[PDB]
Amino acid sequence: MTEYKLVVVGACGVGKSALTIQLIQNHFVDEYDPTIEDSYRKQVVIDGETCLLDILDTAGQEEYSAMRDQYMRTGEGFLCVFAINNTKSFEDIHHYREQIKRVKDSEDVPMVLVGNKCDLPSRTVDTKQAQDLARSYGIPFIETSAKTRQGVDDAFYTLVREIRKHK
Amino acid sequence: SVLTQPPSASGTPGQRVTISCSGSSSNIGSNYVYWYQQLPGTAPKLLIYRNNQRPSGVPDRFSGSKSGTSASLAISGLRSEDEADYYCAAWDERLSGWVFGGGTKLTVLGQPKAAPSVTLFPPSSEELQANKATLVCLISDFYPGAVTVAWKADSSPVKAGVETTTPSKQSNNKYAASSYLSLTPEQWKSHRSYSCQVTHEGSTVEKTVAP
Amino acid sequence: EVQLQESGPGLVKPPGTLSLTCAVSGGSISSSNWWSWVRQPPGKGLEWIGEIYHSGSTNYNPSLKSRVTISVDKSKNQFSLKLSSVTAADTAVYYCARGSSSWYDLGPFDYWGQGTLVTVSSASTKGPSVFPLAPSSKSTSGGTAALGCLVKDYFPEPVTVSWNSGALTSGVHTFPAVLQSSGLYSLSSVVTVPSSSLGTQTYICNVNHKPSNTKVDKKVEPKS
Ligand SMILES: Nc1nc2c(ncn2[C@@H]2O[C@H](COP(=O)(O)OP(=O)(O)O)[C@@H](O)[C@H]2O)c(=O)[nH]1
Ligand SMILES: Nc1nc2c(C(F)(F)F)cccc2s1
Ligand SMILES: [Mg+2]
């Protein structure tokens, strides 16, 4: 029974809490206090292995403090989440990787790029563009919908496998 | 308390003070120790976690250690704002619960004297209509937290009817106290004045009210 | 950041059961932390009561085990304490707290409620009589003047006083209460105001005595 620490990061409104609550509680919260930053725990079987998931749903202001640095540093993998209909969030994905590589002191930190709200009728970020950025980073890319559960397990579980392969 | 701390500690400003905490093999000897600082009338605040780690906002002049079944809080560069109560906490494997020390009150010595300000109120007319009468003497912002309070009807001392609080540390680390004199309305009107006399470090402030 | 607030009867009569509730906001009760109750007799030290996880597991201070029940109500994002067969030994300020993070351990008490005083006693609740402490030509310090509310003969603690519904903050001093030989408390609260404003500005102290579900708003006006 292994303990895996996952940090879900992303810009304001992308669906971090929505995605996390779906994983933990199997329902869709279409409105959740955006200030609430919590840790959650879930036990799951991933490839026949009982896993202990410690998911940190980040929310707080993107402040750069020594506590926030080691608070993030405890994470083994990071879900980098943008919304497919929010270009500024996708442009943020670069800076997020930068902070991840800094506190972790590594160019090879387990990440998964998540395009959320892929249930939407339209979008302003095309899949090909994100896959390019994912390749240019050497990380997976998953489209998810916290509204319908599409790819939610796929996204989180894939971060776990990326953590496995790191040791 | 299951853990043992000295109830008090002293230090003049700038010094280094240590606060000890002793347990047994089943708590401190086995588990992490945590320190909490409590200010007057407020909930405790984490000060040191996991024997020696500082959370956000704790300057480096606070530090903790742990050896065997003992833990220690060190405060160097002692400042007046450090006057507080300090508590250690650890998990006890035999009781299967969180245990505390009794707490240590830290006093910063050599701070300067402050004379009390004294406010004296007569009975209100409302209270007099209710056939009661209370004189209110409010004493505040004094250091050394010891005062004595005497009351005078005209010039004669009054002891009957006097209730006086023990000095209470304010948020600015000076003290406050208050004294109440209960009279019948008749008593209040049959004298020319009552006085609240407050002595502090051998100097006295006396306020007087009349009908 | 998460915030906790205790609420319960200020007074419990022996044999009876103390019942408190901790309302939690800014954080889900289903987070991976432990929710504790801690108490502090006035003037004495802290004592852990017990803790609960959101799944329902509990650990109690073994010395209180036979009298303590802690519950979680996810639907209200609250947890609660019930302590049976109270005695005077249970008179204390009761705090609820969250801590013991699965993510990054800071200890068992990362966040604290404000704490609520519970008095265990056979004496009955008494609400306060509030009298105005009128500012007179003696209670002036030049440009400054003192006026107050005398809050008399109440039980049990606490009483809180605000002025002008909170608009008046600077200059306010509410004093520790006095315990009279009758067993009843009294306190005063005093506020310093400009001597000139006494003709214009109205001053009202807002006395709250939660144990008797009493609030008094007393107008304080200069003396004739
Ligand atoms: N259509 C759709 N809307 C979503 C999805 N995920 C989140 N939302 C909406 O996004 C809004 C904000 O998401 P939120 O959980 O607060 O993301 P966070 O601010 O990063 O924590 C909510 O009002 C949700 O209705 C999704 O998968 N599909
Ligand atoms: N101080 C640091 N913050 C962060 C964040 C956040 F604060 F923006 F969420 C995300 C990823 C890494 C780091 S390192
Ligand atoms: Mg959120």
Residue numbers in C near B97 (CB within 8 A): 48, 50, 59-62
Residues B104 and B187 in one domain: no
- Domains contained in chain B, number: 2
- Retrieve residue B105's tokens: 């009150």
Rounded distance between C-alpha atoms, residue C198 and residue B75, angstroms: 48
In which order are the strands placed within the sheet that holds B62-67?
B17-22, B70-75, B62-67
According to DSSP, residue C168 is labeled B
Cβ-Cβ contacts under 8 Å for C204 (sequence gap 6 or more): C163, C164, C165, C217, C218, C219, C220
Cβ-Cβ contacts under 8 Å for C106 (sequence gap 6 or more): B34, B46, B49, B55, C99
The b/e string for C170-182 (b: 16+ C-beta within 10 A; e otherwise) is eebbbbbbbeeee
- Domains contained in chain A, number: 1
Q: Please name every residue paired with B206 in a beta bridge, in sequence order, or none if there are none.
A: B197
Cβ atoms of residues C185 and C179 within 8 Å: yes
Q: Which CATH class is domain C129-220?
A: mainly beta
**Residue where a domain terminates, one of B48, B74, B108:** B108
For tokens 């302003």, what's the residue?
Answer: A124
Task: At C24, give phi and psi (nearest 5°).
Answer: -120, 125
Q: Which of B195, B188, B120 lies closest to B157 in space, CA to CA?
A: B195
Residue numbers in B near A70 (CB within 8 A): none
Rounded distance between C-alpha atoms, residue A82 and residue C142, angstroms: 63
Number of C-beta neighbours around residue B110 at 10 A? 11
For the domain that residue B187 is a member of, what is the CATH number?
A: 2.60.40.10
User: Between β-strands A2-10 and A77-83, what pairing exists: parallel, antiparallel or unpaired?
Assistant: parallel
The boundaries of the domain holding residue A13 are 2-166
Residues from A contacting C (CB-CB < 8 Å) are 5, 24-25, 33, 35-41, 54, 56, 70-71, 74
Q: How far is CA A153 from CA A22, A24, B74, C196, in A?
A: 9, 10, 48, 69
Cβ atoms of residues C4 and C111 within 8 Å: yes
Domain extents in chain C: 3-120, 129-220
Query: Chain B closest CA to A43's CA: distance in Å?
Result: 25
Assigned domain for B2 exists = no
Helices (H), C23-164: none
Ligand 2: residue whose CA is nearest its atom 1: A64
Cβ atoms of residues C70 and C6 within 8 Å: no
Rounded distance between C-alpha atoms, residue C107 and residue C193, angstroms: 45
Query: What's the half-sphere exposure (Cβ side, CA atoms, 13 Å) at B72?
Result: 10
Span from the CA of A82 to the centroid of ligand 2 (angstroms): 15
Q: Which of B171, B168, B112, B113 lies closest to B138 in space, CA to CA?
A: B168
Query: Chain B closest CA to A20's CA: distance in Å?
Result: 27
The boundaries of the domain holding residue B158 are 117-209
Q: How far is CA C33 from CA A44, C102, C103, in A?
A: 19, 6, 9
- Retrieve residue A120's tokens: 């939407």
Rounded distance between C-alpha atoms, residue C131 and residue B208, angstroms: 20
Nearest CB neighbour to A35, from listed C26, C28, C104? C26
Rounded distance between C-alpha atoms, residue B114 and residue B65, angstroms: 37
| Amino acid letter, residue B174 | K
Supply the Cα-derived Rg of chain A in whole angstroms. 15
According to DSSP, residue B112 is labeled P
Q: Which helix (H) or strand (E) holds A159?
A: helix A152-164
Q: Which of B176, B62, B204 lies closest to C173 in space, CA to CA?
A: B176
Cβ-Cβ contacts under 8 Å for B166 (sequence gap 6 or more): B177
Distance of CA C30 to the CA centre of its chain: 27
Rounded distance between C-alpha atoms, residue A70 and residue B16, angstroms: 29
The CA-based angle C168-C171-C176, given to 5 degrees, is: 105
Cβ atoms of residues A37 and A60 within 8 Å: yes
Superfamily of domain C3-120: Immunoglobulins (2.60.40.10)
For the domain that residue A27 is a member of, what is the CATH number?
A: 3.40.50.300
Q: 3-class DSSP state for residue A57?
A: strand
Residues B87 and B168 in one domain: no
